[PDB]
């Protein structure tokens, strides 16, 4: 699980 | 005399692993006669030494500003780590101590709702799309707006307002050209809070 | 189900006697099947009847939004008057009640400091002027920027940050064209907080 | 004592 914001890495689980 | 500010890091910085959260110790009204400032950084008591030391900056009634920035670790701040700056100056009775740390308390998720343009709104050249957020703790949050993986920068967001149960609420309004909205383009409300799975959620919004 | 937000009025509105502060009760996720909403407004318990009733507004999974705005009196809110909205809907187990009021506590004045552009800053096309504010209570505040009695709108201001002694701090940055700053123009930092004589103070800033 | 903001009346004492 990884979330992205405008192509930049937010967080991983 | 010389006053000191210790600023917490931008909530985005702390929630975005691809970013550098940093605590910032600003010292203002330092005198021309006694300019040297020594910073001492402590993390839960334990001294640390990595801090950056920016040069003096001309100010006003023959004064200076000095800033020292210390990087922090995403997981550190999040844990509840207390950060302490110790400012020392020949013009100081005693050295000044400031303490910043993520607010303690049982974390809570933000609920997010979207409001499309009203009928009156839809008559103007520029329509505004609105985003409501509530029940979040602590108050540190970042709300931004995008459309098609590009940033939308024409928005304002109210400071978190304290709720009667201890959580926080706010709203944010993005304004856009009516044609962009009429064209069918999706606009998304990006919310980053610690208590979101991967710190990220997003409600979106389009006609009709 | 149908969720409710009760928003306090813009701190400027409450501190500017030439303005109308208003509390706002937003109801979202009202159903197509059970659309009617009845609002009941109370000021410290006592019901009041002046509130405006805006028409429904199309929303999403066949939903509606309804808002009712109630004007408030500058001195009322300031006094510590508690405002209560009571929302009623055929889809509600019980009627929902929200409570907003100016934070109680011993008021404190904001201290304001200004930071002119750094040397590196002064090499760019656009320089930023900064304004630091601390020791204020409660957190409701308005910071704006002007130059020559005209508004300057190119600024951002951080939400109030809780201080270890109970007061609040923040900073605000205005960005401007270097030529405007080089020309000699004064730029002012307008701070409106309840605990300011006439709710108003202003630090300014120019070369050199 | 009256204070003004951009020509609009703030407060009087």
Curated annotation (Swiss-Prot), chains B, C:
| Assembly | Immunoglobulins are composed of two identical heavy chains and two identical light chains; disulfide-linked. Interacts with FCGR1A; this interaction mediates IgG effector functions on monocytes. Interacts with FCGR2A and FCGR3A.
State one molecular function term (GO).
Fc-gamma receptor I complex binding
What does the UniProt PTM comment say about this protein? Glycosylation on Asn-61 is required for interaction with Fc receptors and ability to activate the complement pathway. (Microbial infection) Deglycosylation on Asn-61 by S.pyogenes EndoS or Endos2 endoglucosidases prevents interaction between immunoglobulin-gamma (IgG) and Fc receptors, impairing ability to activate the complement pathway.
| Known disease link | Multiple myeloma: A malignant tumor of plasma cells usually arising in the bone marrow and characterized by diffuse involvement of the skeletal system, hyperglobulinemia, Bence-Jones proteinuria and anemia. Complications of multiple myeloma are bone pain, hypercalcemia, renal failure and spinal cord compression. The aberrant antibodies that are produced lead to impaired humoral immunity and patients have a high prevalence of infection. Amyloidosis may develop in some patients.
Any idea what this protein is called? Immunoglobulin heavy constant gamma 1
Disulfides per UniProt: 25-85, 131-189
Gene source species? Homo sapiens (Human)
Encoded by which gene?
IGHG1
**Alphabetically, which GO biological process terms does the record hold?**
adaptive immune response; antibacterial humoral response; antibody-dependent cellular cytotoxicity; B cell receptor signaling pathway; complement activation, classical pathway; complement-dependent cytotoxicity
Attached carbohydrates are found at 61
Ranges for domain Ig-like: 2-101, 110-206
Question: Which keywords describe this protein according to UniProt?
Answer: Adaptive immunity, Cell membrane, Chromosomal rearrangement, Disulfide bond, Glycoprotein, Immunity, Immunoglobulin, Immunoglobulin domain, Membrane, Secreted, Transmembrane, Transmembrane helix
Region (CH2) residue ranges read: 1-104
GO cellular component terms given for this protein: blood microparticle; extracellular exosome; extracellular region; extracellular space; IgG immunoglobulin complex; immunoglobulin complex, circulating; plasma membrane
